[PDB]
Write an enzyme that holds these catalytic residues in place. Sequence first.
Site, PDB file in Angstrom:
ATOM      1  N   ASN A   1       0.852  -1.176   0.000  1.00  0.00           N
ATOM      2  CA  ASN A   1       0.000   0.000   0.000  1.00  0.00           C
ATOM      3  C   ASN A   1       0.894   1.234   0.000  1.00  0.00           C
ATOM      4  O   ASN A   1       1.297   1.702   1.061  1.00  0.00           O
ATOM      5  CB  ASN A   1      -0.939   0.088   1.194  1.00  0.00           C
TER       6      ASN A   1
ATOM      7  N   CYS B   1      -6.086   2.328  -4.688  1.00  0.00           N
ATOM      8  CA  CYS B   1      -7.413   1.728  -4.547  1.00  0.00           C
ATOM      9  C   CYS B   1      -7.452   0.265  -5.009  1.00  0.00           C
ATOM     10  O   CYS B   1      -6.899  -0.614  -4.335  1.00  0.00           O
ATOM     11  CB  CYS B   1      -8.457   2.583  -5.249  1.00  0.00           C
TER      12      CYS B   1
ATOM     13  N   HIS C   1     -11.580   0.670   1.783  1.00  0.00           N
ATOM     14  CA  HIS C   1     -10.417  -0.186   1.609  1.00  0.00           C
ATOM     15  C   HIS C   1     -10.742  -1.296   0.605  1.00  0.00           C
ATOM     16  O   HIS C   1     -11.850  -1.832   0.599  1.00  0.00           O
ATOM     17  CB  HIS C   1      -9.940  -0.718   2.969  1.00  0.00           C
TER      18      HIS C   1
ATOM     19  N   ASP D   1      -4.306  -8.573   1.186  1.00  0.00           N
ATOM     20  CA  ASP D   1      -4.574  -7.282   1.793  1.00  0.00           C
ATOM     21  C   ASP D   1      -3.280  -6.495   1.666  1.00  0.00           C
ATOM     22  O   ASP D   1      -2.518  -6.392   2.619  1.00  0.00           O
ATOM     23  CB  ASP D   1      -5.054  -7.443   3.229  1.00  0.00           C
TER      24      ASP D   1
END
Length: 326
Positions: A7, A12, A245, A262
Amino acid sequence: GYVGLKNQGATCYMNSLLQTLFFTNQLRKAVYMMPTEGDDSSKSVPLALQRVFYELQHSDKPVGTKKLTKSFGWETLDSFMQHDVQELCRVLLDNVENKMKGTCVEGTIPKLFRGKMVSYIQCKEVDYRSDRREDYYDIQLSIKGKKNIFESFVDYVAVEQLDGDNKYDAGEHGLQEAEKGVKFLTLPPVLHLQLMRAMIKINDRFEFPEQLPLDEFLQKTDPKDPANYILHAVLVHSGDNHGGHYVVYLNPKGDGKWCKFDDDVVSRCTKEEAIEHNYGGCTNAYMLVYIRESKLSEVLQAVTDHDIPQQLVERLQEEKRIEAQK
Ligand SMILES: Cn1ccc2c(=O)n(CC3(O)CCN(C(=O)[C@@H]4CCN(Cc5ncc(-c6ccncc6)s5)C[C@H]4c4ccccc4)CC3)cnc21
């Protein structure tokens, strides 16, 4: 195990779409065969995709995507917020379709993602029909008032009626009453279905199966090769416009063994966590990837470090080295 993407700001959905693309093994192998030898190191999307794919294959550490973001120029958040997830995909696969032309691996992208469709307008009481064959790389399903994928396809091929205030300009025959519909001729080896939850983000419940029979939506079925679809990936969003998220579930080997991606954390998860928990009812699915049962093993052919051309290896091997910064 499997390795994550960083991240690194505000990409996105990008990370989730890359990983689904990475684990479409046949697409990956094809990408590696692209001839980027002479491509500008930082202008070139093809090169960028190969690097990310390479790293996702080899890295022990979270993988960086900055040069990729730069290569197609969505360096801001508005970029992503202006666009649909299938539009990102086209930008990436469009550039790789192109680069593969005149090479051994030409046509792999169409081969994997392209299906065809017939759209028609038929006049009730005049002998006149308008048939238009279109390709598609992906499908946009309506969900509002639909309980499941099945109902969505049902609605998709629903025969609309063109009546009174809304009759069809049938040209030489004047305004006429007609019914316009859509119908599927092929369904591709990889099926990308997007769920139209935007309108915002509708959080309504929307159900989808592990196994999806699509024979009954084609015109001609093939007894040899039925249209049974094995759920591969679930692209997921949660939150609202202030905080949201993005995350993706994969069973990369199509064998029911799910992981949660993730960003930089990849973790074992349950089928339930991957599927039922993403129906919605707020954290829910917006795109799902299916593979045709009969092409399962082709698409997901195993990939070795030997499948990557040396020429490319060095280039990246080298590139990394120069990182050397005090
Ligand atoms: C052809 N068609 C019609 C509908 C539809 C459709 O839903 N999909 C799916 C989709 O492509 C997936 C990728 N998308 C996103 O992630 C959306 C991005 C914008 N979000 C709102 C903002 N949040 C902060 C905003 C903001 C504004 C100003 N400054 C800062 C921040 S604007 C909602 C996110 C969203 C997430 C999940 C589900 C739906 C929507 C877009 C939708 C695909 N095709 C479709």
